[PDB]
């Protein structure tokens, strides 16, 4: 594995969860048992390392 | 109020209008 960068759009493959985008700051309160979140547009909106 | 009463990256592209909203 390797680290991640912000404001530079890249591809992310978290254990089979694949996607492309910028990895920017999360600023919303989440439940402790979350693995990943979604937005209104049915898209993977949040990711946890 | 017309603008306010009226209330995205999945391969589609909402091309901005040639004539700007302004």
Q: Would an 8 Å CB–CB cutoff place B9 in contact with chain A?
A: yes
Q: Which residue of B has its CA nearest to A21?
A: B9
Structure tokens at A24: 């920017």
Chain B: closest CA distance from residue A41 (Å): 6
* Integer Cα distance of A43 and A27 in angstroms: 17
Give residues with Cβ within 8 angstroms of A27, minimum separation 6: none
Tell me if A25 sits within 8 A of A6, measured CB to CB: yes
* Integer Cα distance of A21 and B9 in angstroms: 10
Resolution, expressed in angstroms to one decimal? 3.9
């Amino acid at each position: 594995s390797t680290n991640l960068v912000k404001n530079k759009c890249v591809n992310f493959n978290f254990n089979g969860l694949t996607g492309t985008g910028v990895l920017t700051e999360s600023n919303k309160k989440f439940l402790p048992f979350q693995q990943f979140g979604r937005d209104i547009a049915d898209t993977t909106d949040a990711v946890r390392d | 109020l017309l603008f306010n009463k009226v209330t995205k990256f999945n391969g589609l592209t909402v091309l901005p209008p040639l004539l700007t909203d302004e």
